[PDB]
Amino acid sequence: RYRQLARNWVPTASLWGAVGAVGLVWATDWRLILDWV
Amino acid sequence: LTRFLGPRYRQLARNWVPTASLWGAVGAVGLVWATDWRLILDW
Amino acid sequence: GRQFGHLTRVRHVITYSLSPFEQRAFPHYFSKGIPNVLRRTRACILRVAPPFVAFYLVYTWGTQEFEKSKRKNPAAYE
Amino acid sequence: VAPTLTARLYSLLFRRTSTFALTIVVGALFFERAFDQGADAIYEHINEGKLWKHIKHKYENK
Amino acid sequence: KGFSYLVTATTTVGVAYAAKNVVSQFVSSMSASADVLAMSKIEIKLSDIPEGKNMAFKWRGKPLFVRHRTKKEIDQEAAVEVSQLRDPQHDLERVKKPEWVILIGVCTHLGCVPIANAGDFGGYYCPCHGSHYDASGRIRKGPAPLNLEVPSYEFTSDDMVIVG
Amino acid sequence: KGFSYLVTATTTVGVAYAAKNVVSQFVSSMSASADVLAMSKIEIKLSDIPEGKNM
Amino acid sequence: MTNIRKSHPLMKIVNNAFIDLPAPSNISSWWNFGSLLGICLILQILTGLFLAMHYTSDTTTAFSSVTHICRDVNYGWIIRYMHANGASMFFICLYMHVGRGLYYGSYTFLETWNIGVILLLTVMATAFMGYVLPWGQMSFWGATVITNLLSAIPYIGTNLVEWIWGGFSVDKATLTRFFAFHFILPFIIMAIAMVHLLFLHETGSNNPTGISSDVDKIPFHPYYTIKDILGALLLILALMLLVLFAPDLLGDPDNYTPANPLNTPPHIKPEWYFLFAYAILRSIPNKLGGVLALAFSILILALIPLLHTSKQRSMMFRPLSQCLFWALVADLLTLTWIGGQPVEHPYITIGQLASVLYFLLILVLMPTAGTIENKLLKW
Amino acid sequence: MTNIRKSHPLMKIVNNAFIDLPAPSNISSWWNFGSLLGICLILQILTGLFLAMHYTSDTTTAFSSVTHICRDVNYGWIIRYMHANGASMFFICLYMHVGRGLYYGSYTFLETWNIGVILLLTVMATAFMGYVLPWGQMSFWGATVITNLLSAIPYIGTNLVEWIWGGFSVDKATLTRFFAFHFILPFIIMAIAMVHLLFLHETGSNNPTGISSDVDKIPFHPYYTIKDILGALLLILALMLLVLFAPDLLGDPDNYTPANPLNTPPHIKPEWYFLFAYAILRSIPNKLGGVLALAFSILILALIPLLHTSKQRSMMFRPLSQCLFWALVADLLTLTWIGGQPVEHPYITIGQLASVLYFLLILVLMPTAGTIENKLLKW
Amino acid sequence: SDLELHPPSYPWSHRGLLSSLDHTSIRRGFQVYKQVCSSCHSMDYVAYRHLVGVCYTEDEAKALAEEVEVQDGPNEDGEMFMRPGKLSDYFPKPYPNPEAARAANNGALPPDLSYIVRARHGGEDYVFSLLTGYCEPPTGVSLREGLYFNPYFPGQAIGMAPPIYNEVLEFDDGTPATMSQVAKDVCTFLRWAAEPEHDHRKRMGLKMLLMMGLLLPLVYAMKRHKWSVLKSRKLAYRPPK
């Protein structure tokens, strides 16, 4: 029910979060997370 | 400066001196406890 | 943004008050106080009475038991 | 016709601010590394052999 | 739209690089100054503690125990059934030379210093909450979850041990 | 009315006396110590230095 | 307007939150703890600044320094003991404050309750660091055991505890850090308190009855300024009664022993204000489980606004909750008792039940009792 | 309104003084010094708190302590040299601030002007005590000779210099006091800054033309957030340029020598910010005359409002004051020079005429020039 | 009130913004301090941490630091059982305590060289021109034996024995030990010692300089765009009638 209403955000929301999480770590450059790439 | 000075104002000043005069006395009392002049103590 | 003229609407209420210099700080304080203090306390004690009793009982048991284990051990094994 | 480099870049990454931000995070990363690398190199060049990095040899492992 | 945005976009990356670097410097200082080099993994002792009496040394704000064990202590530690220990280790997994047991003198429960030759196993007894350790530094009784920690160490010539 | 004013005045006096002592105590700790002030005014030395120099 | 001093200066208008503001009429004595809370912050501050006028932050001296403050310095003895005792007050007062909004539904002011919570946990850190400054046995070991409790976090913990300490133990490094943070937290706190008051000035103070008092509102100046002054009077009384007749009484710790890192008081424990948390922490076998549970004891507070079930923000008219409310305070008292107890069977088993009873009272019992009461009233 | 984040929280509305506020269009680069002013206050603080995370406030150690911050501690060197240099900037920025106010008549905002003044003087105290924390030959002596310069007061002085010092000299007692007040001033000052901002928000920012801009007003967010960020960028530039390339350059004092109370650098002098103050004292033979005149140097600021004689609050349209404004600035530079000068004939005679020039420029010349210009315009 | 002569801006490898310290100089210089100078002047904040700073290995400096603790060792610090080994120990204090120090040098008190280049107004120039500057007292001048005349001392007279003289020591490599040649190396070790952060700072400064410049250029451009609209806009008054 709720997901359908937020489905557009879900896709758009998903992209921003991954970018934000990755970016902070990338700006942060923590060694353990980075080692994997 | 010039505007403040006036012929009319004098009653307020007279009144102020007493309140001011009373206020002045308090400081001497207040200062004296901290100051602790032996002479003040002698008084 | 004004707190006094905007709180709420009140109709038909009359209030009567008297000046500090005309009255006494305490009017029949001993008589009034004993009743109200006594009446309020009983109700208050009952509601909060349960919390107090349990704490006192548990504290006594804990001190005794902890002390008791520490107190005797030589007699038990020989 | 094709989109100027900027227009390309624009429509792929800057319309959505999510993308934009993602970019910048990424960029900040990549950039830090290149800068340093380049900017450190440049600086070590100006002091050839003046710095311990150059001079470790002398007393190292015999 | 692309050109104007790019300047701001390029600009954003620049602030982040410096900002990340600038932020790191303040953070770095709390983490490391003289630090571990000044106070970590450095020790030297042997003359002070002898005849089965454990000696404690100040190493990185913590007690470092160097204990000279007797054959009887060594034997007793050998006869322990590791399978019944909460933190199972054989005495020989904890020492390099049996007559020498080297331990971080910190109770694994809440950090107090265990007392040597006390407790029910002639090893150590922690007075804070009653953890008993054996002469191998293994936890035998009480709330401590682990055996006392064994640090890295080596023995040089001229009777000496280097811990760290 | 006078009684009411008098009651208010009495409370202030009690506070002031406490306030003077409390304020004075805070001021006093800051101004000097009997650590320092032990060594003050107490000094002697002689005959250990040359009949010529200055110590 | 002309010559209405108040609104003339814009700055002086801002101060008419004291004098002109709408204040509820009916209003238990409990409210006086907000004001008192702020007297305590100011007291602590002046005291601190005079103590930190003659303190040093080194292993060698600290002890001595405090010892010198209490002996050769003029009126530094009371200043210091006023300081120590103060903080007890500061906490006694804080826990009245929280009780009153746990009882009366003041926590309804979500915004204001989340600033409170921030306030409470800021004041907690300051008190944790200030007790170690002296560098006495109790202090020394208490900061080791607590900080190291942080090393329960799996991936980071370990590295992180060593960052905080600025080394592998608690030597100079750590003791200067506490001095710096202790000095600057109360100044940051003061801005939060004023941000707290800000929000709370948008909706005014709740009452016993739990109902809006906009129909009966009093000038703060006439009435409340005297009440507050009077509440100070009593507050200072307790402070001085403590600090003048029984200096040490409330300062459980007798450890006026310079810290020796091999030595240990087998009885290691935070002061009274932390006991609750302590006890709740020991109830869990696992270290990490305890730390989470420790956090939740305190952090659990922000969840109460969501937990509220009743239609009467006032507990005043609700029996059953009044009964569990009180129990939780007495459970709280029970847990504080466990804090100074040998960690042995008798206390263990008690504490454990207490710890579950605390979370029950907050997480499950009360909530249900709220519903019931609503259904009895036919609401 | 609904879901307008800004005015939803009341708190977040208070932050819309940055984003939504009416800001004049036209506006020299000079005004960025307000913002940078704050920038510096925040940088000193973050820096201070980390240094005071590894500093000790005793005779014995203080020198060592700083020495240890710059050697063994990781990135403690930059933190400390960033903190030293910053304070330079902080002052360089301050004196741009007051220049602007002097020149465009921003000082018309009397209430804002009076806070500024307090601001200025508070920082001034701060800077004077911090420089003494490291307890080096320059610091040691500088405190004595300034503090003692207070003993000029006839009746009290003498007693009072001894209270401030906590004894007869400047031993530990004084050294820990400065540590505590240095620490707590900046926090108090931030409150002031905000109070300063408060008042200024009630009449907005004056301009180079000197006329109201209400007919031309701009978004602060759109425009002035980038300007301010840009300002930073240059500000930092200067602070790192200094701190990275010439750490000591601007820090005249080379006295990295632990203070020996019998020893003296015959050349004793305050830093660049305080250089002007030292010079003012020198031109007067008499001690007391010099202390009064030193205070009046700085304290003369609050007069200028009353001195204003022209009809154009903007100096921009009045040549003649633009000339005497600049001269004062260059007289101020001249005075700063004297500060690092042997107190001998050459410098004496110069300083004395510069100290009269400064007070003429401020007390007598400018005010007349104002009038003149007004009369040439037929105003 | 005597004129004081001032130091030349002596040609240094590091005079320049990007220029950095020459460790070989450091290295050399070190020895100079250790043989020529350890005798009466101390360096308290300097540990035996030349390792990477001075290119001395860890094993190299360990050993170098071991013998210094064997001879001057922690017996002068208060460590009774101390001998070779340790690396946290700081350079060994010429004398037990200051007062002594003045006695050995008759009233004068050998300044801690730790910060001397930074400490003395005028930097490594002064330090070099002091050591290398020693000329003949001026016609009609008198000099107490201790009071050697030096052309660069404030009071025009210093209690300094032959600071450095040709062939005072010998370096590993074979660097020609000239009075001056050795001074050039001694100063440098002082400058490196006086400002350890500064050596790191110059390298950082270069990185900082480029980033700041790049950031500044973008901001001016970024700043211009946001403010462009107000600047671009022209407002024309319209008559009411």
Ligand code: HEC
């Ligand atoms: C033989 C002992 C001795 C040695 C070796 C020695 N000095 Fe000195 N030095 C002194 C004394 C004593 C003074 C005090 C001068 C005075 O107070 O007149 C002094 C003063 C100085 C000064 C003067 C600073 C000032 O203005 O007070 C400098 C610079 C200095 N030493 C550096 C050095 C350096 C660099 C070396 C090694 C290259 C060195 N010294 C070697 C004994 C020594």
Ligand code: HEM
């Ligand atoms: C409300 C916030 C504060 C709390 C809860 C607090 C509490 C404490 C406590 C509990 C101690 C330990 C004292 C002892 O038991 O011996 C202490 C010490 C100390 N505090 Fe505070 N304090 C506060 C604010 C401040 C401030 C604002 C300052 C300085 C401006 C300060 C400076 C000091 C100093 C210097 C000491 C060490 C000397 C001593 O042991 O008394 N504190 N503080």
Ligand code: HEM
């Ligand atoms: C530094 C500590 C604190 C200070 C200085 C302080 C200050 C005050 C003051 C002066 C008031 C107004 C009068 C009153 O209601 O008593 C008040 C109210 C309030 N405070 Fe606190 N506060 C503090 C801590 C807290 C905490 C720990 C909480 C809860 C987590 C909190 C939540 C509240 C609430 C909810 C109110 C409004 C209640 C009502 O009047 O209906 N405060 N505060």
Ligand code: HEM
């Ligand atoms: C604008 C306000 C401040 C100014 C002007 C200022 C200025 C100074 C100055 C000029 C020094 C001398 C450093 C030297 O030359 O060695 C100093 C030292 C010091 N300051 Fe600050 N400071 C300020 C704020 C603070 C704050 C807020 C703290 C603590 C939070 C602090 C802590 C220290 C410490 C511990 C030292 C001693 C060690 C050293 O020399 O670095 N200062 N300060």
Ligand code: HEM
């Ligand atoms: C702690 C130091 C200070 C800080 C951080 C600070 C900050 C600011 C800022 C950010 C502004 C707005 C921009 C501008 O006009 O430049 C401002 C304006 C102003 N400041 Fe300051 N200031 C300080 C000191 C002072 C002093 C010492 C005074 C005067 C005694 C002062 C008086 C003023 C005035 C009059 C204005 C408004 C001018 C106008 O735009 O018409 N400030 N201040």
Ligand code: FES
């Ligand atoms: S430290 Fe807790 S039982 Fe030993």
